[PDB]
Amino acid sequence: MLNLKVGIIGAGPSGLAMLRAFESEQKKGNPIPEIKCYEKQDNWGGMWNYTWRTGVGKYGEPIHGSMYKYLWSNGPKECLEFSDYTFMEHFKQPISSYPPREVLFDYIQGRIKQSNARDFIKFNTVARWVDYLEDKKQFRVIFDDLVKNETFEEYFDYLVVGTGHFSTPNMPYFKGIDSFPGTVMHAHDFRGADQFIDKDILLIGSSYSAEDIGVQCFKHGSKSVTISYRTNPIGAKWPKGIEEKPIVTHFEDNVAHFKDGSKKEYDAVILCTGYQHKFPFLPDNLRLKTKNNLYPDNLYKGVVFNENERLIFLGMQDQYYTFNMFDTQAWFARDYMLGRIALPNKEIRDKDIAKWVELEKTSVTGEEHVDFQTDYIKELIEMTDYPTFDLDRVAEMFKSWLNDKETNILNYRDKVYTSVMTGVTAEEHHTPWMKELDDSLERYLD
Amino acid sequence: MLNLKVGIIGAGPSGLAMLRAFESEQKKGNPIPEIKCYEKQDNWGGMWNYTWRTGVGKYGEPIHGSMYKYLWSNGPKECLEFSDYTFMEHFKQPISSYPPREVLFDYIQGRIKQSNARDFIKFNTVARWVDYLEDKKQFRVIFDDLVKNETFEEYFDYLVVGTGHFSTPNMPYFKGIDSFPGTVMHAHDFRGADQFIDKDILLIGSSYSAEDIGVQCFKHGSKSVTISYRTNPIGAKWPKGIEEKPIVTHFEDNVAHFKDGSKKEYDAVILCTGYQHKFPFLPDNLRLKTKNNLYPDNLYKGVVFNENERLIFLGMQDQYYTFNMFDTQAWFARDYMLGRIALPNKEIRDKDIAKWVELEKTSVTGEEHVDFQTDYIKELIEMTDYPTFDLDRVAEMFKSWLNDKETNILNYRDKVYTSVMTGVTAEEHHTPWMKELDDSLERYLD
Numbered sequence: 023m024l025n026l027k028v029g030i031i032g033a034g035p036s037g038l039a040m041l042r043a044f045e046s047e048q049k050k051g052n053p054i055p056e057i058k059c060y061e062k063q064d065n066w067g068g069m070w071n072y073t074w075r076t077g078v079g080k081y082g083e084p085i086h087g088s089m090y091k092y093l094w095s096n097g098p099k100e101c102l103e104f105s106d107y108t109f110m111e112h113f114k115q116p117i118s119s120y121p122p123r124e125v126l127f128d129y130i131q132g133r134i135k136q137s138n139a140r141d142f143i144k145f146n147t148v149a150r151w152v153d154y155l156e157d158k159k160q161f162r163v164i165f166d167d168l169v170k171n172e173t174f175e176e177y178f179d180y181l182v183v184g185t186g187h188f189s190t191p192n193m194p195y196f197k198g199i200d201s202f203p204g205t206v207m208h209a210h211d212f213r214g215a216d217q218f219i220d221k222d223i224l225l226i227g228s229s230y231s232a233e234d235i236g237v238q239c240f241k242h243g244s245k246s247v248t249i250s251y252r253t254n255p256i257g258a259k260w261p262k263g264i265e266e267k268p269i270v271t272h273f274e275d276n277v278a279h280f281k282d283g284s285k286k287e288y289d290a291v292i293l294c295t296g297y298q299h300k301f302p303f304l305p306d307n308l309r310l311k312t313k314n315n316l317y318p319d320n321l322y323k324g325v326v327f328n329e330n331e332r333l334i335f336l337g338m339q340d341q342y343y344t345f346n347m348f349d350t351q352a353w354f355a356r357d358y359m360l361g362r363i364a365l366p367n368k369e370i371r372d373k374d375i376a377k378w379v380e381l382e383k384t385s386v387t388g389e390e391h392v393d394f395q396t397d398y399i400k401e402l403i404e405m406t407d408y409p410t411f412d413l414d415r416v417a418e419m420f421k422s423w424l425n426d427k428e429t430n431i432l433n434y435r436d437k438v439y440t441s442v443m444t445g446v447t448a449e450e451h452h453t454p455w456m457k458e459l460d461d462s463l464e465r466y467l468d
Numbered sequence: 469m470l471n472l473k474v475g476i477i478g479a480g481p482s483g484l485a486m487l488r489a490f491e492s493e494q495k496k497g498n499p500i501p502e503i504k505c506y507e508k509q510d511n512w513g514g515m516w517n518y519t520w521r522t523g524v525g526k527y528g529e530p531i532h533g534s535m536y537k538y539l540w541s542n543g544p545k546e547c548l549e550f551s552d553y554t555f556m557e558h559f560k561q562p563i564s565s566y567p568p569r570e571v572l573f574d575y576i577q578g579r580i581k582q583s584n585a586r587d588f589i590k591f592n593t594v595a596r597w598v599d600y601l602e603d604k605k606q607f608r609v610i611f612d613d614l615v616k617n618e619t620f621e622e623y624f625d626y627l628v629v630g631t632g633h634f635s636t637p638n639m640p641y642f643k644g645i646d647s648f649p650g651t652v653m654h655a656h657d658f659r660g661a662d663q664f665i666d667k668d669i670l671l672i673g674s675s676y677s678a679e680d681i682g683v684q685c686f687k688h689g690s691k692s693v694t695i696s697y698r699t700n701p702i703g704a705k706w707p708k709g710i711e712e713k714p715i716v717t718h719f720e721d722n723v724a725h726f727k728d729g730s731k732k733e734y735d736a737v738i739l740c741t742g743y744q745h746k747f748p749f750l751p752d753n754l755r756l757k758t759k760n761n762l763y764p765d766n767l768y769k770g771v772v773f774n775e776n777e778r779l780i781f782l783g784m785q786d787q788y789y790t791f792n793m794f795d796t797q798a799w800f801a802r803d804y805m806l807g808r809i810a811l812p813n814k815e816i817r818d819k820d821i822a823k824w825v826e827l828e829k830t831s832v833t834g835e836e837h838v839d840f841q842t843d844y845i846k847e848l849i850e851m852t853d854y855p856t857f858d859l860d861r862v863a864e865m866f867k868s869w870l871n872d873k874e875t876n877i878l879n880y881r882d883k884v885y886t887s888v889m890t891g892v893t894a895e896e897h898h899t900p901w902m903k904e905l906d907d908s909l910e911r912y913l914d
């Protein structure tokens with residue numbers, strides 16, 4: 023065992039990828055540092071865990087989860103698929119390209135349970151505060167064991183933060199919103215459309231959440247859905263029951279007034295206005311201070327905190343790629359920590375960061391975004407022993423998905439794609455997505 | 469100024485009472501310590517501020533507020549009157565015994581505005597973490613300035629914690645609640661009865677929140693309200709529209725099943741199941757680890773943390789008495805910090821704590837609880853120059869209030885009581901409470 027201590031905050035996909043990188047090293051027969059992972063929730067898997075709770079959890083901490091009932095795969099499952107654990111391996115039968123959450127999580131956990139992750143994680147424990155000690159070159163981290171109601175401290179030579187960035191709402195005030203008599207919530211609190219059956223719903227925002235929650239409400243029987251955008255409409259061809267409007271200027275009781283001078287009464291308002299990066303446990307000189315984008319500033323190779331290189335952030339980028347991207351990040355972080363990758367000087371890092379920050383700014387369209395992230399991963403992968411996979415093919419599948427959503431927003435989850443791991447083409451699902459109101463694993467594999 | 473630094477966490481009634489106690493000392497011409505108060509919200513007033521937000525606030529910290537639209541004082545104002553600032557001098561017109569939230573906020577604010585206290589409070593700032601430094605005999609406190617997204621630290625000789633204990637929900641799981649298709653929330657996130665017009669509502673619990681939210685819903689137009697109790701029903705004489713059932717055993721879709729074998733469909737479930745003490749910013753050896761009751765253990769005179777006497781807790785007891793109890797506590801804290809009251813040794817404190825804990829355990833009926841807290845305050849108020857008032861008379865008024873509520877739960881707020889500070893009898897309000905749907909300060913005073 024190396025004379026090095028590494029602390030990992032979070033046992034979601036990012037933290038688990040850090041554990042994967044180290045497990046791979048130890049499977050070579052190579053020594054690794056002492057590793058400890060700490061997770062706020064009672065289970066691993068992060069965002070993938072569904073909870074009925076909203077606001078704060080049973081112990082009073084902000085609720086991490088943002089997933090809802092009736093959630094299905096964002097993009098094709100073939101863009102998620104792991105090299106080392108394929109969908110064919112797990113399910114032993116072809117399935118469609120868009121499984122529901124329970125099915126994806128069954129696959130995700132199938133791999134985690136084969137790993138040694140359980141050996142390294144302490145659950146129900148939150149990182150509460152962090153001091154960096156200049157003279158020790160270590161982080162002193164305060165943890166709160168929520169189950170024991172005890173606090174404790176640990177010291178680490180490297181600290182890896184994988185706490186996500188889709189959990190603390192950006193929940194802006196709108197004029198008069200406090201006069202609104204119905205439900206007012208952020209997408210973070212949305213748990214399913216059943217409570218909104220036969221109601222008129224206003225969604226504010228125009229991104230993934232607005233689109234998916236809006237369609238769900240329509241599909242599951244809301245009286246009507248309005249999506250209100252700030253800058254750009256979704257532009258999808260909507261059915262009767264969903265419509266788009268420009269931005270809300272203000273509310274007067276249950277009436278929303280819009281920029282085009284129209285107004286409508288609503289039963290509920292759901293703000294689909296995105297999330298903030300929030301690190302309450304970090305002093306501000308260690309915080310990522312960024313808007314959500316594909317390449318936050320102050321992160322060398324998108325991973326090493328530029329102003330204190332012993333602090334590592336994983337998964338803090340906006341995401342097309344998820345698990346496989348986190349893997350490439352973790353492998354790089356590992357090799358850096360093990361001394362296998364030499365960190366260049368500050369001037370060189372600054373230059374590289376500026377280059378990628380500028381490349382990101384220059385990307386505008388969805389296809390350009392996909393290509394940017396693909397290029398980002400391509401670079402990381404070439405720096406380590408991480409097994410290559412067909413990034414070009416996956417990028418083309420993301421681009422095809424984006425075009426499918428533009429072509430038909432209600433039915434794109436009916437399309438099938440081909441695995442880049444196994445070459446197997448997904449099989450048409452037994453029920454068209456619009457007709458499937460049962461998201462259970464049992465129903466899906468039935 | 470004394471060479472002593474006192475930090476106060478919270479600018480609700482308790483923190484403001486601490487400020488007032490020190491203000492009152494300085495008015496004698498005596499030196500006081502350097503004092504700094506820190507408050508999470510944008511203004512003072514604590515629980516008495518209304519926010520339309522739920523779950524977490526705009527900066528992602530758990531929401532403090534539990535008050536809702538249409539909330540009125542639930543005990544006679546004569547029971548909470550400050551001993552050094554009367555309703556007579558504040559409003560200068562006669563008012564009733566049960567004012568709405570805005571009116572009591574005005575009163576709370578009235579007293580603090582007599583001083584320059586506002587310049588001693590830093591708003592939008594959360595206490596994040598505390599280290600007690602044994603060798604320095606000081607608390608190192610980390611604060612998070614939410615607006616600037618900056619952290620900073622301060623050192624204090626004494627730390628006064630006035631952060632409340634009615635903000636972190638006790639949110640128990642009930643079998644099948646995760647499959648209930650309607651609105652589910654804790655009372656903490658209830659913001660008013662308008663959202664439940666024409667709906668069937670289930671309230672779980674049988675104390676103040678259940679009782680008041682039940683009557684609110686009924687008054688504002690709910691179809692029906694069910695209050696489900698764990699041990700004892702409220703036992704009030706309910707109008708048609710409100711009923712009581714024993715405890716919910718499980719949910720099956722929108723159907724709640726009760727202990728008595730009955731069942732009923734509901735549109736919404738509100739858990740009125742109380743709150744937890746929660747101090748995420750304190751190490752566990754500085755936490756009160758207590759269930760809610762009238763005398764939490766480990767607090768000498770209900771105020772001084774027994775295992776570290778430089779830590780002071782205000783208002784951590786369950787409450788019949790409120791404002792003038794916090795004052796009594798704050799004055800005692802002040803005199804201790806100034807050295808006007810000498811702390812007895814640990815053995816003596818242990819004995820006194822045990823005596824009071826046992827007396828509390830013995831108290832069972834509402835009247836016994838009232839007498840217990842009366843006795844607690846009677847002892848403490850004699851120890852300082854906070855002006856002693858007729859506690860026995862307030863106890864009688866509380867017992868009358870319990871009687872009024874038993875007699876007619878719908879009109880108890882129309883009853884009038886006499887001040888023990890000034891002997892002024894409250895005047896019947898211009899509108900009966902059941903007929904008053906306008907809770908504005910303006911409507912109330914005019």
Ligand SMILES: Cc1cc2nc3c(=O)[nH]c(=O)nc-3n(C[C@H](O)[C@H](O)[C@H](O)COP(=O)(O)OP(=O)(O)OC[C@H]3O[C@@H](n4cnc5c(N)ncnc54)[C@H](O)[C@@H]3O)c2cc1C
Nearest residue numbers: 032034035036062068069095096148149185186188337344
């Ligand atoms: C609504 C939604 C739907 C999505 N759907 C898909 C999809 O279909 N397919 C897909 O590929 N991707 C999807 N994603 C994105 C992607 O899968 C997730 O963002 C992914 O889980 C990122 O993993 P992570 O570990 O970086 O963050 P998270 O999964 O959020 O994990 C962070 C972990 O850190 C823990 N944590 C946080 N703070 C602390 C603390 N102070 N102390 C200790 N632990 C802490 C949390 O409990 C959590 O377990 C979706 C995202 C969202 C929001």
Ligand SMILES: Cc1cc2nc3c(=O)[nH]c(=O)nc-3n(C[C@H](O)[C@H](O)[C@H](O)COP(=O)(O)OP(=O)(O)OC[C@H]3O[C@@H](n4cnc5c(N)ncnc54)[C@H](O)[C@@H]3O)c2cc1C
Nearest residue numbers: 478480481482508514515541542594595631632634783790
């Ligand atoms: C719904 C409800 C209705 C009530 N109605 C009545 C009533 O009608 N009559 C009555 O007499 N009493 C009522 N009470 C209780 C009573 O008013 C309390 O005695 C009083 O509000 C408590 O004052 P406090 O300052 O001790 O706590 P609070 O008023 O809760 O104030 C705590 C303050 O500390 C701040 N804070 C918390 N954590 C931090 C942190 N980490 N850093 C910085 N600041 C922090 C909070 O923002 C808040 O301002 C009610 C309570 C509730 C919840």
Ligand SMILES: NC(=O)c1ccc[n+]([C@@H]2O[C@H](COP(=O)([O-])OP(=O)(O)OC[C@H]3O[C@@H](n4cnc5c(N)ncnc54)[C@H](OP(=O)(O)O)[C@@H]3O)[C@@H](O)[C@H]2O)c1
Nearest residue numbers: 094095096194227228229230231232234252253294295296
């Ligand atoms: N499995 C699924 O199908 C599923 C569904 C839900 C979410 N997800 C995931 O959840 C993550 C987050 O996506 P997200 O949509 O929640 O947030 P987001 O992608 O970050 O998008 C933010 C949206 O909110 C709008 N907005 C921000 N501030 C606003 C304001 N002050 N007023 C009005 N509008 C404002 C933005 O408008 P502008 O154009 O002006 O910026 C933008 O439309 C993604 O990773 C996504 O993958 C997946």
Ligand SMILES: NC(=O)c1ccc[n+]([C@@H]2O[C@H](COP(=O)([O-])OP(=O)(O)OC[C@H]3O[C@@H](n4cnc5c(N)ncnc54)[C@H](OP(=O)(O)O)[C@@H]3O)[C@@H](O)[C@H]2O)c1
Nearest residue numbers: 540541542640673674675676677678680698699740741742
């Ligand atoms: N001004 C107003 O109108 C107003 C309105 C709301 C609240 N308040 C204040 O807010 C404070 C808190 O009052 P509160 O009523 O919310 O809390 P509370 O007084 O602590 O009451 C808690 C209730 O929850 C019940 N309970 C706890 N756990 C339960 C479980 N697992 N299952 C079922 N029931 C459970 C308790 O039943 P048991 O008896 O069995 O323990 C109890 O009835 C009080 O100071 C109150 O005055 C004032």
